[PDB]
Amino acid sequence: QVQLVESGGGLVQAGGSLRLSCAASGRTDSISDMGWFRQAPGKEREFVAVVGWSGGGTDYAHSVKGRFTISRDNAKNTVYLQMNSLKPEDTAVYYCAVGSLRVGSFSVEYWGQGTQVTVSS
Amino acid sequence: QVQLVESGGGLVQAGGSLRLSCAASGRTDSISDMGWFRQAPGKEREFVAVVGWSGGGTDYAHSVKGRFTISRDNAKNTVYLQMNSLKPEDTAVYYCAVGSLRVGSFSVEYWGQGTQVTVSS
Amino acid sequence: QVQLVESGGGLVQAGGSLRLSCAASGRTDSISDMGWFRQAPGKEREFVAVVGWSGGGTDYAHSVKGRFTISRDNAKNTVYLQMNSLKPEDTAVYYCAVGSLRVGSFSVEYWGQGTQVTVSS
Amino acid sequence: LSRLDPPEAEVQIDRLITGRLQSLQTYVTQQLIRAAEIRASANLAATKM
Amino acid sequence: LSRLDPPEAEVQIDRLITGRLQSLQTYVTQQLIRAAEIRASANLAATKM
Amino acid sequence: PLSETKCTLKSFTVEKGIYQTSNFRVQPTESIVRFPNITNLCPFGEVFNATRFASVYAWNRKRISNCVADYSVLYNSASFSTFKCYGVSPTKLNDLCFTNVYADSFVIRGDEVRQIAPGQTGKIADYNYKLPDDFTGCVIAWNSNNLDSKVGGNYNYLYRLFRKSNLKPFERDISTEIYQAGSTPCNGVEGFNCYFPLQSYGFQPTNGVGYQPYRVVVLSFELLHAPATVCGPKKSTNLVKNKCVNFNFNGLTGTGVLTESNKKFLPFQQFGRDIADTTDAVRDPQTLEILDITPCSFGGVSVITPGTNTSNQVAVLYQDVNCTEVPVAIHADQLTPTWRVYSTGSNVFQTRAGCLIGAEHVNNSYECDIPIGAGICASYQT
Amino acid sequence: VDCTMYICGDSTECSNLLLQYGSFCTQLNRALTGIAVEQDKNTQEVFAQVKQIYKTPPIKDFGGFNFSQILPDPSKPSKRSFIEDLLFNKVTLICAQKFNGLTVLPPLLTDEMIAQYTSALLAGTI
Amino acid sequence: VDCTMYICGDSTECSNLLLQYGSFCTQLNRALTGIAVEQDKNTQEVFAQ
Amino acid sequence: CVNLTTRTQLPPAYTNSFTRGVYYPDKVFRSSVLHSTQDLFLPFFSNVTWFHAIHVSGTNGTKRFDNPVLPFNDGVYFASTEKSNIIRGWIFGTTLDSKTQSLLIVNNATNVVIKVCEFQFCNDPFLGVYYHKNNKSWMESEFRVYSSANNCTFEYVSQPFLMDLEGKQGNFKNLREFVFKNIDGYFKIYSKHTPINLVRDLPQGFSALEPLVDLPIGINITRFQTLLALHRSYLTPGDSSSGWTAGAAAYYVGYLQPRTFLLKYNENGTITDAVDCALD
C-alpha cells in the first residue's frame, strides 16, 4: 500500500511564498503523477497542480495559472511545490494525492493526510 | 538546544479529522519519546498523546483514548498526531514538547511555539 | 541575465524577529556583493544591509545598525537576513539588489521583485 | 545525456569512465602478463632453433 | 582545504586518494613487470658469462 | 605532419621509423530517421466531419485509444474559428504519447463558445457542459451555418437551464423531472415557479454572426502510468546508403554505415546482434529489406619519415581505411598547403594495413628500413 | 585500442571529463604499442635467423632420404609444405570485434615470408 | 578465491549490486584456475620425467 | 447459463513435457551463435498437467467435460493437439466476473477475436455445435460464454479463417502450443503450429514459439480457463439421447519459472535447440 507523508506549510502573508513537500513510500514503482488538492471550509475539493514522472506536462488550475511552480525529485521520491504571488483566497488545507491523469476527472487511488496553509491579507 | 516548528491543524466541523506535525532540528540523536500537550483557554496544559522511538507502545489520555492516533517518522524526524471523531471539547492550542517519559511527570526538555486548532459544534 | 526571487517577510508584533531571504540564479559567477533595500510607501528606497563574497566586512545602515543580522550562504547561493529589535518605522517593501558596491552610489546590475514586510506597534 | 540534466550527469559519466578505465587497465595488465609469457616462450623457441 | 569546508573536503580529497592510489598501483604493476623482464635478462646474462 | 611527430615525441629531432600521432573518424552527414508506413489514425475526422451532432446537454462521448493524434493536418489548415489550448501549448503535446483521450462534440451558439472554459460559470457551463479546473485539452470550434441551418429555421436542438444543483465537472444526467422551487413546491405539476429543465433551442439564417450555430469538439489529453495508447504524428526521413551517418530506427540510436545485405531475417525479427552483442543489422521499417551496420573508419594516423637530418619530407599512413575515404577523414579544416598534399593528389598506395600517402610504390624489393605491416617497408633512398 | 574512443563514443563531454584523469589512455596506448613491437621482435628473432635464402636442388636425391612432407611444393597455390598446410588448416570473432577501436591487423611478417624463411632454413640444414 | 562471496558475505543486495560490475569476479576465478593448472603442470614437468 | 450436468470428476493425471515450451526471448536476429538469457521459461522435463476431452463408446463409457479454473502465477504454457478444431479460445482474468476487468479470446469458427472487458463469465462457458437438417454442415449456434458484455476497451477482428469441423477419427493431424506472459503491463502470446502423426503423449522434437500478438493491457491476470466445444447429443448424427457430447480433444497447462537458458541459433535465425541451466 502506497503511503503519503507531508511536511512544510505554515502561516504566510499576502504576496509571500511557501513550499510544500509530499513523499511517497511503498509500491511506488507504478506511480508516475501526483497531484495537490484544496478545499475551503464548506467547499468541495478542487484540482491545484500536478507534475509528471519526466517533469513535463504539468497542468495548473485557471485561477492559479502563471503563479505556481512544481518540481518532482525522482531520486528522493518527493515532489516540491513552490508558491508565488499568494492571495488570501489560497487559505485552505492542502492535500497531496497520488493518481493517474484521466480525461473527465483526476482519479486518486490513495489520498494523503495533507497539511494546512494559511494566507493572510 | 533543539528547535521545533509547528504545522498542521485549522478549523474543522464536528466529527471531522485533523493532523498535527512538528519538526525537530538540532541535537535530536537523544530523542526517543515524543509527547504532545494542549492548552484550553483558562485551563492548564494537559497530556494528549505519546509515541515511542520504535513507533509502538503508544499511549493516550483517558478522555481521548480510542480517538487519537500518533505516529513518528524517523527518516523525516517528524511526528504526526492524527485526530479522529473530533469534538468541540478538544478545541485547544497544541504545543510541541520534547522530553523523556518520566514516571510522575513528563519531563519536557524543549518547548515549541504552539499551533491553533478549532473544532465547531 | 540574473533572476532574483524574494521569500519570507510578513506581519510581526513589536519587538519580534523575522527572517528574509533572496535567491539568485543564472550568471552568478559575477556576483560578489548583494545589496538589500526597503521601500516605504511614499518614500525612496534606502540601504538596509549588504553582504560580501567571503561573508565578512558587512556594513549596515545607520537607522538599522546594531539590530540586524545578515549572512550569505555561497553553497546554496542564498542570503539570509535575520532582523531583530523591530520597530514600526521598519515597515516597508523590502528588495534585494545584486551588483557592486561603488563609492558614492551603489551600482546595481540586477533588480528583484520585492517582498512584503510589516511590523505592528 | 537525454534522460538526466547535466548536474548529476557529470558524476554519472565520471562513474562510467571510472568503471571503463578499471576494466581497460585490468585488460592491459592481463595482456602484459600474457605478452611476457609469450616473449619467454619465443626466446625459448629461438634458443631451440 | 582552505577554500572548501570539511563536509565536502572529505569527498574531494577522497577522490584525490582514489586517483593517486590508482596511478601508484598502475606504476607499481608496470615496475614489477619491468623488474621481471630485467630479472630474465640478468639470468640470461649470468648464464652467458 | 613532421611538426606533429616532433611535438608528440617532445623533441625537435626525430629518428628513422614510424610514429603514431593521432586518430581519424568520419562525421555523420546529417541524420537518419525511419518509420513504417503509418500507425492507425485516431477517428478524429469522424467526430469533426460528422453529419449529425448531438445537443449540448446530450453531448456524445467517444473513446479514443490505440491510435495516433494526427491533429497537425488540421492545425495548420486554419479552418476553425477557435483553437485555444489550456495548460499546454498546442504543438508541445504533439511530441508526447497520451494513454487516454476522449472526444466530446456538441453544437452551441457563437457567443456561447466562451462558456466552454475550465472553471467557467454561466447558464450553459453550470447546466450543460462543465469543465474542471484540470483541463489539459483544447477547445475547438468552427462555423456550422452551412449545415445547421435551412429555410424556416431548425428546432432539433435542446438545452438544460434549470437544475436542483450545479453540475459536477464532466457530469451528464438526463431526466424528465420538472424542477420545483423550494419556496413554492409543485408536487409533480407544472405550476408557479416550476419550469421544465429542457427548453427549445434553434437557429435561423437571419441570425447574426454571434448567433449562428457553431460546431464545437472538445479534445482532452491526459497521462496514465499504463502503457500509452494515443501518440503524435510520426516523421520519416529519406534513407541513404553507403554513407556514414547517425541512424534512429524505432528509437535505436547509433552511428555507422547502412549498406545492403544478403542475410534474410525472420518475419518477426527486428534487430540483429553478433557474438559481441552489438547491433549490426536493422531492418528498414518502410520496406522489407535488411541493412547492415558497419563502422565508418576507425583507424589511426601514423607518420613515416626518416631522421630530421639529411631529410625533411614525411609520409603519412592511415590504418584500416580505404584510399577513397581518406580526404574526408578529419580534413577540410587544417592548413591547406602542407596538409592537402599529404591527404590527396598522387603518391597514393593502398596496402593491407591501410592507405599510404606520400610514398611512391616500387616494384623492387629491398631490405626493410621502416616497418609498416604486411611485409611493406619504407626507405628514403631513391 | 583507442582508449579515448573506447571509453567515450563520439561524446565531447565524456572526452572532456576523461581528459582530467591524467594521461592514463596514453600510458595504455604506449603499453599496447610496446607489446606489439615486442611480438614483432619475437617473431623476427625466432624466424629471421639466416642471413640468406637457400634453395633445395631441383633433383631430390639425398641418399634415399625423403623430405617431400617438409619441403614446399609449387603445385599448391601457396609455397608451403604438406605439414605446414595441415597445421594452418587445423588451427582456426576477431574480425567481428572491430566496433570499439579494436583494429587488430598489423602483421609485420606475412605467412608467406615466414614459410619462405622456414624453407630457407630447411634447405640450409639439408 | 570466491569473489562473489569474498566481497559480499551472505548478502543478496550486495550480490545484486556486484552483478552490475560485469564479469570481474569471473575473470578473477578464471585467472586463479589457470594459475593452479599452470602450477600443477610445472610440478608434473619437473618431477614426472 | 446454468450449472452444467454430467460433471464426472477424476484425479488429474500428469505427463512429461520434454523440451517443448521454448519461445524467442526478444525480436533480435542471431546467426550461428550461442546466447544465454534469463527469462520466464518452462523447465525441461516438467510434469505438465494432463487434460483430455473424449467420449468412450458405449453406455458404460464416461464422457468428460473438463473446464476448471487454474492459477496464472508468473507464466502459463498451453499446449493442445486435435484433429477437429475443438479448442478455439481461452478466458483470462483475476476475479472472473464483472467486478474486475478481464480479457477474452473467442473463435466462432471464423475470424479471431480479442476482447478486454468486464464480462460476467458463467461457471461453465462453452460453445455449442448444431447440425441443421436443411443446412447439413457443421456450424456454431449456441453462445453462452457470458451472460452479458459491457465496458468495451479493446476490440480486434480478423479475416475469415475456418477449418473442417467434422469429427473424423484416426491419428491426430496438428498440434498447437501457446505461451502466455503478463509483465510490465504487457500481455505477450507465442504460438507454433506443427504437423504430427502420433496419438498419445508429446513429440520428442524441438520447435521454438514465435510471437504473434503483443497486447498492451495493464490488467492483472491470476486465473484462467479454457473454452470447449460441445456437440448436441440429442441432435448429433447417429446419437439420439438428450445431453451434451465432446469430441476427441486434449489440452495441456504448463507453468513458467525463472530459469537461465542457453538458446542455440542456426544460420538463418531459427532456434534449433535449447538447454536449461538447472536440469543436470
- Residue corresponding to grid cell 606489439: G36
Buried b / exposed e over C3-20, threshold 16 CB at 10 Å, is: ebbbbbbbbbeeeeebeb
Across the interface, of F278, F371, F374, the residue whose CB is closest to G99 is F278
Answer yes or no: are the C-beta atoms of F70 and F41 closer than 8 Å: yes
C90 touches chain A (CB under 8 A): no
Closest CA to F35 of F224, F251, F207, F190: F251
Question: For residue I9, with 0-12 CB atoms within 10 Å meaning exposed, 13-18 middle and 19 or more buried, which class applies?
Answer: exposed
- Residue corresponding to grid cell 490505440: F66
SS3 G121: helix
Angle at the Cα of I161 from the Cα atoms of I156 and I166, rounded to 5 degrees:
135
**Does the CA dihedral F96-F97-F102-F105 come out positive or negative?**
positive
- Residue corresponding to grid cell 634415399: G64
Neighbours of C44 (CB within 10 A): 7
Answer yes or no: are the C-beta atoms of F293 and F275 closer than 8 Å: no
Cell of H10: 551472505
User: β-pairing, I244-246 with I70-71?
Assistant: unpaired
Helix D6-48, helix E6-48: angle, nearest 10: 10
DSSP code of residue E10: H
Answer yes or no: are the C-beta atoms of I5 and I63 closer than 8 Å: no
Way it was determined: cryo-EM
Question: A81 - beta bridge partners?
Answer: A20, A70
Question: For residue G81, with 0-12 CB atoms within 10 Å meaning exposed, 13-18 middle and 19 or more buried, which class applies?
Answer: buried
- Alpha-carbon gap: D33 to the closest alpha carbon of chain E (Å): 8
Overall residue count recorded for chain H in this entry: 49
- Alpha-carbon gap: C71 to the closest alpha carbon of chain A (Å): 20
Chain A interface disruption, residue of F100, F134, F138, F171, most A CBs within 10 A = F134
Angle at the Cα of I252 from the Cα atoms of I249 and I254, rounded to 5 degrees:
175
Answer yes or no: are the C-beta atoms of G21 and G32 closer than 8 Å: no
| Full 3-state SS string of chain F | CHHHHHHHCCCCCCCCEEEEEEECCCCCCCCCEECCCCCCECCHHHHHCCCCCCCCCCCEEEEECCEECCCHHHHCCCCCCEEEECCCCCCHHHHCCECEEEEEEEEEEHHHHHHCCCCCCCCCCCCCCCCCCCCCCEEEEEECCCCCCCCCCEEEEEEECCCCCCCCCCCCCCCCCCEECCCCCCCCCCCCCEECCEEEEEECCCCCHHHCEEEEEEEEEECCCCCCCEECCCCCCCCCCCCEEEEEECCEEEEEEEEECCCCCCCCCCEEECCCCCECEEECCCCCCEEEEECCCCCEEEEEECCCCCCCCCEEEEECCCCCCHHHCCCCCCCCCCCCCCCCCCCEEECCCEEEECCCCCCCCCCCCEEEECCEEECCCC
Answer yes or no: are the C-beta atoms of F6 and F19 closer than 8 Å: no
Question: I180 - beta bridge partners?
Answer: I76, I189
A107 touches chain C (CB under 8 A): no
Distance CA F311, CA F308 (A): 6
C52 touches chain A (CB under 8 A): no
Amino acid at I266: N
B7 touches chain A (CB under 8 A): yes
CB-based contacts of F286: which residues, under 8 Å, 6+ apart? F34, F35, F36, F37, F236, F239
- Measured in whole angstroms, the distance separating CA G29 from the mean position of its chain's CA atoms is 20
Answer yes or no: are the C-beta atoms of B85 and B27 closer than 8 Å: no
- Dihedral angle, C-alpha I87, I91, I97, I100, nearest 10 °: -170
Beta carbon pairs, D and H, within 8 Å: 7
Angle at the Cα of A63 from the Cα atoms of A59 and A67, rounded to 5 degrees:
70
D19 touches chain H (CB under 8 A): yes
Distance CA I158, CA I162 (A): 11
Segments forming the whole domain that contains residue A61: 3-119
User: β-pairing, C68-73 with C115-119?
Assistant: unpaired
Distance CA A38, CA A40 (A): 7
CB-based contacts of G87: which residues, under 8 Å, 6+ apart? none
CB-based contacts of D32: which residues, under 8 Å, 6+ apart? E30, E33, G31, G35
Distance CA G76, CA G111 (A): 15
Beta carbon pairs, A and B, within 8 Å: 32
Distance CA E33, CA E11 (A): 33
Overall residue count recorded for chain F in this entry: 382
Amino acid at B59: D
CB-based contacts of A113: which residues, under 8 Å, 6+ apart? A4, A5, A6, A95, B19, B80, B82
- The DSSP result for G49-110, as a single string, is --SS-----SS--BTTB--TTTS--TTSSS---HHHHHHHHH---TGGGTTSS------SS-
Overall residue count recorded for chain I in this entry: 280
CB-based contacts of B55: which residues, under 8 Å, 6+ apart? B71, B72
Amino acid at G104: V
Distance CA F132, CA A48 (A): 11
User: β-pairing, F290-294 with I139-143?
Assistant: unpaired
- Residue corresponding to grid cell 537576513: C81
**Does the CA dihedral F143-F146-F147-F148 come out positive or negative?**
positive
Could you give the number of structural domains in chain A?
Answer: 1
- Measured in whole angstroms, the distance separating CA A92 from the mean position of its chain's CA atoms is 12
Cell of F348: 597514393
CB-based contacts of I47: which residues, under 8 Å, 6+ apart? I14, I15, I16, I17
D21 touches chain G (CB under 8 A): yes
**Does the CA dihedral D8-D10-D16-D22 come out positive or negative?**
negative
SS3 E48: helix
Where does chain I have alpha helices with state H? none
Closest CA to G71 of G111, G122, G17: G122
Answer yes or no: are the C-beta atoms of C81 and C68 closer than 8 Å: yes
Q: Which value in Å is the resolution of this experimental model?
A: 2.9
Amino acid at D41: S
Distance CA F251, CA C81 (A): 51
> The domain that contains A17 carries what CATH number?
2.60.40.10
Distance CA G37, CA F19 (A): 12
What phi, psi does F248 have (nearest 5°)?
Answer: -140, 95
Amino acid at C41: P
Closest CA to B27 of B106, B94, B110: B110
Judged by CB atoms closer than 8 Å, whether chains meet at G98 and F374 is answered as no
- Residue corresponding to grid cell 599448391: G76
What phi, psi does I172 have (nearest 5°)?
Answer: -65, 145
Residue F5 gets the label, from left (phi > 0), alpha (psi -120 to 50) or beta, of: alpha
Judged by CB atoms closer than 8 Å, whether chains meet at B80 and A113 is answered as yes
What phi, psi does F235 have (nearest 5°)?
Answer: -105, 145
- Alpha-carbon gap: G76 to the closest alpha carbon of chain F (Å): 21
Neighbours of B28 (CB within 10 A): 13
- Alpha-carbon gap: F281 to the closest alpha carbon of chain G (Å): 13
Distance CA B22, CA F319 (A): 70
Chain F interface disruption, residue of I23, I26, I29, I184, most F CBs within 10 A = I29
H31 touches chain D (CB under 8 A): yes
Give the Å distances, CA to CA, from E45 to D40, E38, E49, G45.
Answer: 15, 10, 6, 17
Domains of chain I: 13-280 (2.60.120.960)
Closest CA to I149 of I174, I111, I187, I116: I116
- Residue corresponding to grid cell 614510424: F18
Name chain D contacts of G11, Cβ cutoff 8 Å: 1
